[PDB]
Amino acid sequence: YKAENGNVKIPKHPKRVVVMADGYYGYFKTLGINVVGAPENVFKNPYYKGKTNGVENIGDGTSVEKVIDLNPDLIIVWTTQGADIKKLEKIAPTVAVKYDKLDNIEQLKEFAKMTGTEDKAEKWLAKWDKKVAAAKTKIKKAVGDKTISIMQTNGKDIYVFGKDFGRGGSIIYKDLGLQATKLTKEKAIDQGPGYTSISLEKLPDFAGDYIFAGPWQSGGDDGGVFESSIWKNLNAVKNGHVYKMDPIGFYFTDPISLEGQLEFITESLTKL
């Protein structure tokens, strides 16, 4: 059908897709499309491997040779993935998808039109819109109108995320309608491209009543922030309103990964 990389007619009702874009794997596994290969991370996501990977192979997303051997019938990859968009076309209809062009929820609706299973898609949106109801209440009835901030650490820099950049932020601020610090909203939501880099200095400005902290990438030095003097000085840390966050798990935004995401947020704010 139509695409950012020229209209390259796709076979309706495929049966062998190679999701080159890790992020979009959970979207196909949910819709029903049979995937035949996905990059590294896909198997490293808890929400994924944790319970899904019947017949899919690996490959970081470069070896243009491993892609053929899987004899796909559809090659769906990010526009800026990194692999030559022309070469992959030499294997099977290759549909390039612009990163963040679409939404997060709407992005699954597209992958439903592109294929031909809207009935399996609309079936999910029902379950989602439903879980949210429960959660939105249970939460508000257990946290009132406090301030919840999502932030990750990278060296000496900290990224206090808002509503537009992943990390459950779509869940926290949109799907849950929870409020953040007047500053997190002022620079990470009502402005920023989704996040706001900071330092150990600018922290008691963002740190809300509850924190969803966690490292930037799995395996490595936390930077010394979570082990700093100002971080443990905060009020949110004291009361015990800090919940680590698995980066590999919180990096996706597909359906399967969101359910686990929101679910984590829920118990992390309803326990006594």
87 shares its domain with 218: no
Residue 253: both structure tokens together = 């935004």
Give the integer Cα–Cα distance in Å for 57 and 70. 8
49 shares its domain with 179: no
Identify whether the C-beta of residue 73 lies closer than 8 Å to the C-beta of residue 16. Answer: yes
65 shares its domain with 140: no
Give the integer Cα–Cα distance in Å for 45 and 26. 10
79 shares its domain with 212: no
- List of residues 6+ apart from 86 with CB closer than 8 A: none
Give the integer Cα–Cα distance in Å for 160 and 228. 17
Per-residue DSSP letters for the chain?
A: ---TT------SS-S-EEE-SGGGHHHHHHHT--EEE--THHHH-HHHHTT--SS-B---S--TTHHHHT--SEEEEETTSSS-HHHHTTTS-EEEE-TTTS-SSHHHHHHHHTTT-HHHHHHHHHHHHHHHHHHHHHHHHHHTT-BEEEEEEETTEEEEE-SSSSTTHIIIIIIT--B--HHHHHHHTTTSSS--B--SSS-TTT--SEEEEEESSSSS--TTSTTSTTTTTSHHHHTT-B----TTTTT--SHHHHHHHHHHHHHTTT--
Give the integer Cα–Cα distance in Å for 236 and 206. 11
Quote the number of domains for the chain. 2
Identify whether the C-beta of residue 183 lies closer than 8 Å to the C-beta of residue 205. Answer: yes
127 shares its domain with 211: yes
Q: Please, which residues bridge with residue 181 across strands?
A: none
Give the technique used to solve this structure. X-ray
111 shares its domain with 126: no
Q: Resolution of this entry in Å?
A: 3.2
Sheet holding 74-78, edge to edge: 35-37, 17-19, 74-78, 94-97
- CA-CA-CA-CA torsion sign (14, 16, 18, 24): positive
59 shares its domain with 94: yes
86 shares its domain with 153: no
Identify whether the C-beta of residue 211 lies closer than 8 Å to the C-beta of residue 243. Answer: yes
Which CATH number goes with the domain that contains 141? 3.40.50.1980
Sheet holding 148-154, edge to edge: 157-161, 148-154, 210-215
Provide the greatest CA pair distance for the chain.
Answer: 58
Domain limits at 211?
Answer: 116-272
